[model samples]
Target: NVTKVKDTNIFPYTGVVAFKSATGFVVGKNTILTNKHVSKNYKVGDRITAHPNSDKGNGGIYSIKKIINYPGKEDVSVIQVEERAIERGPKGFNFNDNVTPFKYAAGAKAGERIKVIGYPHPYKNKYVLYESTGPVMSVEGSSIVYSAHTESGNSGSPVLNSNNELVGIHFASDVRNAYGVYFTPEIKKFIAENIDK
Candidate 1:
């Protein structure tokens, strides 16, 4: 089950934003990384906002420049945002202040502790930012299985290791268990290729 995260620093590099009302996060200076399934149906040039539950200070709104997806790839996708419009939320002058490329784990060992920050939908209460932390149960196939709690709205959330380096992207859950697109070597290569260069 997902326990609540009370600190803002738990996953400082991420933001729980929306697309079809789904959660996503910031990666590079002009890119918003989220699930392929989450942004796939969205047309190119579609504009979206980040942190609908809260403001990211002086940042937020962005438009899709492109959607990259390998047909057979696992549920992974990258959205290229207008470099000029990424003016605020969770990302701005400080988004890439120290780490120009951002920090993320190439992969992780089993049972390593992890944390996830995002927005989860609630029927009776207003949606808000939430975090779930636990040791990864395992990384299997192309996903990381865990006991952490997640739901529909958390579709594109990032899973960070104890070091706070992103290790996976949330993609699915079965109420009792959750699965994320593990940032294994291949996928890491994909992101590395597209993000830093």
Candidate 2:
């Protein structure tokens, strides 16, 4: 399913932010989703600073209370931030607005229009969020091959469908396009097991 909107203001992109050196977003009310490799090298209790670029890049530094990285080729990691993040919220994003939070989409069909939100280092600064849109070319194994322009530091960005639901997680990019971990039964199971209880 694909729907296109002319104004990016219609989308609540505040949910996406810079998590550590990569990009991530709030999937659940308290759960943040990113790439497995982004958190792969870190320990369980490590602290992850999340920046919304709202307050001119002074979002807040939050501790990773828990990390749920499923064991597989899927490059996904779900994290729970400490109380600090909840208190500070995002800088430029209005959390009170009626923005749809990220929801898992397991029925990501081929050719579905998708958009990626993240902070690519090529932009000259990590505080500004960047967005790219393209169509899904195919889905191979646990990955989704899309034409969305992506790059380094976008390793853990969220991929959303026209409906703004989380359809995938961006991790890698080549000369022509990019790839992300799409949602599946196994991914659902892993997230369910790792989220805050």
Candidate 1 global CA lDDT score = 0.67
Provide backbone clash counts, one per model.
4, 2
RMSD of each: 3.7, 4.7
TM-score of each: 0.78, 0.78
User: Per-residue alpha-carbon lDDT of model 2 for 141-189, expressed as tens digits?
Assistant: 6788899787787888888888878888899999677898877777878
lDDT of 2 at 73: 69
Please write out the lDDT profile of model 1 over residues 1-197, one tens digit for every residue: 45444443333633444565576777776666788778866877787665544323324556677788734568888777665555554555333331222377867877787877676764333345677887788887677887788778788888888776788888898846788887767776777666623
Q: Judge candidate 1 at residue 134 and give its lDDT.
A: 76
Collision pairs in model 1: 2-149, 59-88, 59-89, 60-89
Q: Name the 10 consecutive residues with the lowest summed lDDT in model 1.
A: 93-102
Candidate 1, residue 65: Cα displacement in angstroms equals 0.8
Residue 164 in candidate 2 has what lDDT? 76
- Clash count in backbone of candidate 1: 4
